[PDB]
Design an enzyme around this catalytic site. Structure first.
Site, PDB file in Angstrom:
ATOM      1  N   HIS A  56     -35.050   0.617 -70.762  1.00 27.42           N
ATOM      2  CA  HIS A  56     -34.360   1.889 -70.554  1.00 27.42           C
ATOM      3  C   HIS A  56     -35.438   2.805 -69.978  1.00 27.42           C
ATOM      4  CE1 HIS A  56     -31.737   5.359 -72.357  1.00 27.42           C
ATOM      5  NE2 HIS A  56     -31.601   5.232 -71.049  1.00 27.42           N
ATOM      6  N   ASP A  57     -35.216   3.289 -68.764  1.00 24.73           N
ATOM      7  CA  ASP A  57     -36.184   4.146 -68.093  1.00 24.73           C
ATOM      8  C   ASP A  57     -36.711   5.297 -68.952  1.00 24.73           C
ATOM      9  OD1 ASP A  57     -33.661   5.360 -68.023  1.00 24.73           O
ATOM     10  OD2 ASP A  57     -33.770   5.956 -65.922  1.00 24.73           O
ATOM     11  N   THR A  58     -35.850   5.883 -69.780  1.00 26.95           N
ATOM     12  CA  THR A  58     -36.243   7.000 -70.642  1.00 26.95           C
ATOM     13  C   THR A  58     -37.134   6.560 -71.811  1.00 26.95           C
ATOM     14  OG1 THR A  58     -34.349   8.439 -70.116  1.00 26.95           O
ATOM     15  CG2 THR A  58     -35.389   8.746 -72.263  1.00 26.95           C
TER      16      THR A  58
ATOM     17  N   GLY B 159     -40.132  13.767 -62.681  1.00 29.53           N
ATOM     18  CA  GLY B 159     -40.091  14.591 -61.485  1.00 29.53           C
ATOM     19  C   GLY B 159     -40.083  16.091 -61.718  1.00 29.53           C
TER      20      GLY B 159
ATOM     21  N   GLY C 103     -34.558   3.342 -55.919  1.00 27.65           N
ATOM     22  CA  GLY C 103     -35.261   2.281 -56.625  1.00 27.65           C
ATOM     23  C   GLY C 103     -36.672   2.194 -56.067  1.00 27.65           C
TER      24      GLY C 103
ATOM     25  N   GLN D  71     -30.414  20.984 -57.568  1.00 31.85           N
ATOM     26  CA  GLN D  71     -30.229  20.045 -56.486  1.00 31.85           C
ATOM     27  C   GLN D  71     -28.969  20.441 -55.716  1.00 31.85           C
ATOM     28  OE1 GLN D  71     -30.588  15.727 -57.269  1.00 31.85           O
ATOM     29  NE2 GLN D  71     -31.567  16.252 -59.227  1.00 31.85           N
TER      30      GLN D  71
END
Length: 478
Positions: free
Chosen positions: A235-237, A401, A15, A303
């Site tokens: 909504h982050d997107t 990112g 966060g 990842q």
């Protein structure tokens, strides 16, 4: 002649409390991390949950760290992952645990909903893709397994609005995040009776979804000055796409991250059987503009590999990957086998064998596989989207990112035969701020903000290379 806005950007793994400074004069916008904190799934006894209370602390800590720094705050805005919600009783007390989307309680319910209401009916009413953990199935799950809680539920709030509730004491139901529940009717922009009925939820638990830009309420700093809390595209997107410097109808975006998204903007949603078969989703965005998109795998693959082989040098790795030819190792990144295997390396390898291919065993080869496969998947998805809307794209915008990986960025361009503009990296946070600024009356609309971004953020153009190995590959298998 400046405004300072705070963006609370929360992801599944972390966060952030970001502070942005908008200089109306220079048309300049600058970011600055104020406080970071960890986020993560917890297992509160059979249940997978979010430590909402620890997140509320971390947010308050950062909100406060800004006020203690004698900086004036004009507005606050929170955006988070979607689908999840928190239940509240009339006294404003949490009812039950804050169950994460990654819980198993919803296993089997998606398939049940399609048999009982109808795949096409659910899809045509909401225009939202079928994801096993959609709010709809979570609510059905809530009522089928926790009959006791039902009478104590007074309000259901999506994660972003909850934290807004903790700060202001006022409730809200942000439209863009709201559409992710697969509970909103695409023609009324309101909760779908028949879907809420099937879910077992109560309409009184929600209020008319309201578009982004409204002031939810206020937050009081250590002193007493009142700082307004704005409903942004929570909504982050949706926030990420707002900040994608799109210009025109021939442009597309790819929200590049652990999980990724690829789509375009449209005045109307696509609910025909074609859209349905391709797993496309019609998410709500700002200005009543739909984000016609498709969920794509992403770098979660890399990842897990960087993690399993204890690789600390992302670079050198990219450098080494490049000494290797491409499209020698091809897998399908969207196959369920890659959602969560015990060994991501063993799974990639298994996949390559099943398809009579050589096995990628070195770090470079594993990275070579991931990258070529992603670009190829991306190029295929972009192709699905052009076929859907009826026309090719001229530009691909990569944000988040993942837009930092220049090797992946040049591969997508070569594979898509399309020009790629990378940036900005802080897409979610920038979009959050953009909506705040529109509410403060500093910018007139999204395009106005995107223009700020196109000049503010250093965007990177990657040109398609027809002489690239991956380009040759696509060409001959076509």
């Amino acid at each position: 002649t400046f405004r300072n806005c705070v963006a609370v950007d929360l992801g599944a793994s972390s966060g952030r409390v970001m502070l942005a400074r908008y200089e109306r004069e220079c048309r300049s916008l600058t970011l600055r991390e104020i406080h970071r904190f960890n986020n993560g799934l917890h297992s509160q006894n059979g249940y997978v949950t979010w430590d909402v209370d620890s997140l509320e602390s971390a947010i308050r800590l950062g909100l406060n760290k800004v006020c203690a720094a004698g900086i004036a705050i004009d507005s606050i805005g929170i955006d988070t992952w979607g689908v999840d919600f928190v239940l509240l009783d009339q006294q404003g007390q949490r009812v039950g645990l804050p169950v994460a989307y990654r819980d198993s309680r919803t296993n089997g319910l998606m398939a049940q909903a399609q048999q009982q209401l109808g795949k096409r009916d659910i899809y045509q009413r909401s225009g939202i893709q079928f994801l096993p953990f959609n709010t709809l199935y979570q609510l059905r799950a809530l009522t089928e397994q926790q009959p006791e809680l039902i009478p104590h539920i007074a309000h259901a709030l999506l994660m972003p609005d909850y934290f807004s509730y903790r700060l202001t004491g006022k409730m809200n139901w942000e439209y863009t995040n709201a559409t992710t529940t697969q509970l909103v009717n695409i023609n009324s922009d309101d909760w779908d009776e028949s879907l809420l009925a099937w879910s077992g939820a109560n309409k009184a638990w929600f209020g008319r979804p309201t578009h982004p830009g409204n002031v939810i309420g206020h937050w009081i700093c250590p002193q007493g000055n009142e700082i307004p809390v704005v409903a942004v595209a929570s909504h982050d997107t949706a926030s990420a796409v707002i900040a994608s410097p799109l210009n025109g109808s021939r442009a597309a975006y790819l929200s590049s991250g652990t999980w990724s998204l690829m789509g375009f903007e449209s005045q109307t949603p696509f609910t025909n059987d074609t859209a349905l078969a391709a797993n496309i989703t019609n998410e709500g965005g700002a200005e009543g503009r739909y984000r016609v998109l498709k969920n794509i795998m992403g770098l979660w693959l890399l990842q897990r590999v960087l993690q399993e082989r204890q690789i600390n040098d992302l670079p050198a790795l990219i450098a080494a990957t490049q000494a290797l030819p491409a499209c020698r190792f091809i897998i399908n990144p969207n196959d369920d086998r890659f959602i969560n295997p015990d060994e991501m390396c063993s799974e990639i390898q298994a996949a390559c064998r099943e398809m009579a291919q050589p096995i990628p065993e070195s770090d470079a080869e594993l990275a070579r596989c991931i990258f070529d496969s992603l670009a190829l998947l991306y190029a295929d998805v972009l192709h699905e989207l052009a076929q859907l809307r009826g026309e090719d794209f001229s530009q691909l915008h990569i944000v988040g990112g993942g837009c930092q990986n220049t090797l992946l960025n040049q591969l997508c361009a070569d594979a898509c035969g399309i020009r790629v503009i990378a940036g900005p990296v802080e897409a979610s946070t920038l979009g959050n701020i953009g909506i705040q600024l529109m509410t403060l009356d500093e910018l007139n609309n999204v395009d106005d903000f995107r223009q700020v971004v196109s000049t503010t953020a250093n965007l990177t153009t990657f040109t398609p290379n027809p002489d690239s190995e991956i380009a040759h590959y696509v060409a001959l298998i076509h």
